[PDB]
Design an enzyme around this catalytic site. Sequence first.
Site, mmCIF file in Angstrom:
data_model
loop_
_atom_site.group_PDB
_atom_site.id
_atom_site.type_symbol
_atom_site.label_atom_id
_atom_site.label_comp_id
_atom_site.label_asym_id
_atom_site.label_seq_id
_atom_site.Cartn_x
_atom_site.Cartn_y
_atom_site.Cartn_z
ATOM 1 N N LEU A 1 11.213 -24.853 58.739
ATOM 2 C CA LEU A 1 10.780 -25.597 57.880
ATOM 3 C C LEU A 1 9.579 -26.199 58.405
ATOM 4 C CD1 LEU A 1 13.965 -27.492 56.315
ATOM 5 C CD2 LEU A 1 12.701 -25.312 55.458
ATOM 6 N N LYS B 1 7.168 -27.448 62.220
ATOM 7 C CA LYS B 1 7.285 -27.740 63.761
ATOM 8 C C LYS B 1 6.481 -29.080 64.034
ATOM 9 C CE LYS B 1 8.455 -23.115 65.776
ATOM 10 N NZ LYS B 1 7.959 -21.897 66.245
ATOM 11 N N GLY C 1 9.028 -32.174 67.414
ATOM 12 C CA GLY C 1 10.049 -31.660 66.846
ATOM 13 C C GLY C 1 10.032 -30.528 65.548
ATOM 14 N N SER C 2 10.991 -29.751 65.515
ATOM 15 C CA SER C 2 11.187 -28.710 64.381
ATOM 16 C C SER C 2 12.418 -28.951 63.728
ATOM 17 C CB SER C 2 10.793 -27.115 65.072
ATOM 18 O OG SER C 2 11.771 -26.897 65.720
ATOM 19 N N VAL C 3 12.336 -28.493 62.566
ATOM 20 C CA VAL C 3 13.435 -28.554 61.352
ATOM 21 C C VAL C 3 13.491 -27.179 60.920
ATOM 22 C CG1 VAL C 3 14.291 -29.655 59.530
ATOM 23 C CG2 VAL C 3 12.559 -30.942 60.711
ATOM 24 N N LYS D 1 17.507 -30.459 62.875
ATOM 25 C CA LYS D 1 16.219 -31.013 63.429
ATOM 26 C C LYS D 1 16.429 -30.695 65.178
ATOM 27 C CE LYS D 1 13.013 -34.663 64.494
ATOM 28 N NZ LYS D 1 12.489 -35.970 63.992
ATOM 29 N N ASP E 1 6.365 -46.003 60.430
ATOM 30 C CA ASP E 1 5.591 -44.593 60.173
ATOM 31 C C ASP E 1 5.889 -44.451 58.483
ATOM 32 O OD1 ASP E 1 4.139 -42.558 60.746
ATOM 33 O OD2 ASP E 1 5.761 -41.073 61.237
#
Length: 295
Positions: free
Chosen positions: A23, A25, A26-28, A47, A141
């Site tokens: 999904l 890139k 952390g990456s999901v 995640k 954020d």
Amino acid sequence: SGAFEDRDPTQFEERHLKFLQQLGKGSVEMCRYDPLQDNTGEVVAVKKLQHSTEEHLRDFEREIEILKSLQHDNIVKYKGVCYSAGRRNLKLIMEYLPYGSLRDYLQKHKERIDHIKLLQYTSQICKGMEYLGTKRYIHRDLATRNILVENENRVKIGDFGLTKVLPQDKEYYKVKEPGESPIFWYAPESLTESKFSVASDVWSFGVVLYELFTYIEKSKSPPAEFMRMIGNDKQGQMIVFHLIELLKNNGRLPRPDGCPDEIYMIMTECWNNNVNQRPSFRDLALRVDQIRDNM
Ligand SMILES: O=C(Nc1nccc2[nH]c(-c3c(Cl)cccc3Cl)nc12)C1CC1
């Protein structure tokens, strides 16, 4: 060979989590959880980290605890954890939201977006933020890229990796951190003093509202507009110096084309240099729903 007792549906078994798609890139990743081995099961988002340093893992564990503590219609649902690599790695399991980030949705699905929808999303974002306030959480954020879309009628706040918890007797959290900041969403006191609060979330919310009413026209993004005001050729610290000076002396993002004056008025009240004069998320939710109800 073995008996089985499941007393913890928040622990996802690695062998039953099946890859569907990457999904971002952390990456999901998108995965299917299929314990009954029958080629079906719930679709979930997963995640993972890139580097499990003592620091990044501690932060990831805190993000997991934060997400798990939240239960609200307008916040991404925690589902559980997976202790993968034979219990030597950690992954977060959460609900999958088909339409992805609000930033992308606005860009890709303009055919289904009008002002009614925009005010509905605005309202839901305020209510999610009201809920965070009850936990004394400061998001730090807020941006359309970090809000997720379940369907045409529902958006949810995500991206809790920067979230801070205020102690009982404290009204701001000062955090100095290395690397890049989302400077074009930051309140002046966050830029100058690294001070974050519910009121700095309100400032960022103003920018979110701006983003909604620009429909993510590429030339109208907060970075694009601020850089035009500052001077397009500026690089590095010079950008920050000029952004601060601009904001301290009332320079602001312009009213987007076709944005009602009353909605622009909301953005400008959020963008008050005086921290204590910014409206609350409850004030905003009420005002927005009253605008919606009065038509
Ligand atoms: O990615 C999708 N849905 C998603 N569902 C559930 C959780 C999701 N987290 C994200 C996401 C990504 Cl990859 C990158 C930056 C920021 C965010 Cl907040 N996206 C998520 C849809 C578009 C395929």
